[PDB]
Every structure is written in structure tokens, then in C-alpha cells.
Amino acid sequence: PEIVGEEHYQVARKVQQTLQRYKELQDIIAILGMDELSDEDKLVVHRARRIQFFLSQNFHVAEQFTGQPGSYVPVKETVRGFKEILEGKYDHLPEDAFRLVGRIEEVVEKAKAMGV
């Protein structure tokens, strides 16, 4: 926190904690099933899917292969985006529209294009 800042440090450590908790549930989900875990762990894997898809970007380099023009995302805006996904603001959006977006407003600009 003395280097990156305090808010960035709490958001990054909470993202690491929820992705670690989703990593610990890999065999349970894969073998025993999805409908049997609990609540407050289905919420964990619920937010963890939206987190581990939002970490991906559309690159400027992949414009020649996919078509979408790419994005450069500042650090304050991705800290704000992961804070908003950790707080639960975007739990009603699907697990797509977090795939391959730059900013956090592009998530809702893609989800209004697909669905709700």
C-alpha cells in the first residue's frame, strides 16, 4: 500500500482472496456439482466468474483478427471497476459482457446490447 496506494491494495487483495477461494472450490464444483455447495460460496464463485472474465481485455493488436478497436485502461479506472464488481453492483449482469472489455462502463454498454 505504500507504493500502489491504499484503495488499489485492498481491491487487489480482495480479488486475490476471492479467486483463491474459487480455486479451492475447483474439484468440488467439477465433481460433486454446482447446485449443492452453499450460499456465501455460490456467491463467491458467482462474483469470481465475473472477476476472472473482467481481467481480460481487447488488445489494440487483436484488431486485425477480431475487429474491435482495443482499449488502454488506466489504473484508477480498473481499481474502480474491480471495486464495483467486488461490492456486488454487477451481479445481475451475465457472465458474458465481462469478456474482452476495457473499462467498467463497457460492461453495461455490452450487456444492454446483448440482453437486459
Binding site: 474439484d27 467439477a30 465433481i31 456439482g33
Partner: protein, 72 residues
């Protein structure tokens, strides 16, 4: 599972690529799910279908000696 190709995909023809994708997916799935099937709980049907699929992949991927197959 451990065998790596570093070109792979740029080597294959289009027809091999289309089906080798899903063959790699369900063989990796069977290699993961076979770990939980040597003793114990006798897993449910939802991945028993995947284990039967993967055993058929393993049985497809066998050959004899000096019998090469064309691409088609």
C-alpha cells in the same frame, strides 16, 4: 496430456482442426475426471457420460503396428 506441440494448429488441415479441438477438450476432461474414479464414491451420471466419452476417445486413439491412416 503432457505431449506439447509448439506449432500446433498451424500444422493441421482445416478438417482436422475443427474436430481436434473438441477431441482435445474431452480427452483433457477425461484425464481430469479419471482421477476421482479409482476408489470411493461411484460418481454420478453427469460426468459418467464424460468418462464413457473419454474411454471411447482413448479407444479411438489406438493403432496397430505399421498401419498409417490418411487424413480423411
Amino acid at each position: 496430456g503432457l505431449s506439447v506441440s509448439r506449432v500446433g494448429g498451424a500444422a493441421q488441415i482445416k478438417a482436422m482442426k475443427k474436430v481436434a479441438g473438441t477431441l482435445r477438450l474431452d480427452l483433457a476432461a477425461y484425464r481430469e475426471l479419471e482421477a476421482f474414479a479409482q476408489f470411493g464414491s461411484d460418481l454420478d451420471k453427469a460426468t459418467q457420460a464424460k468418462l464413457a466419452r473419454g474411454a471411447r476417445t482413448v479407444e479411438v486413439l489406438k493403432q496397430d503396428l505399421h498401419q498409417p491412416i490418411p487424413v480423411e
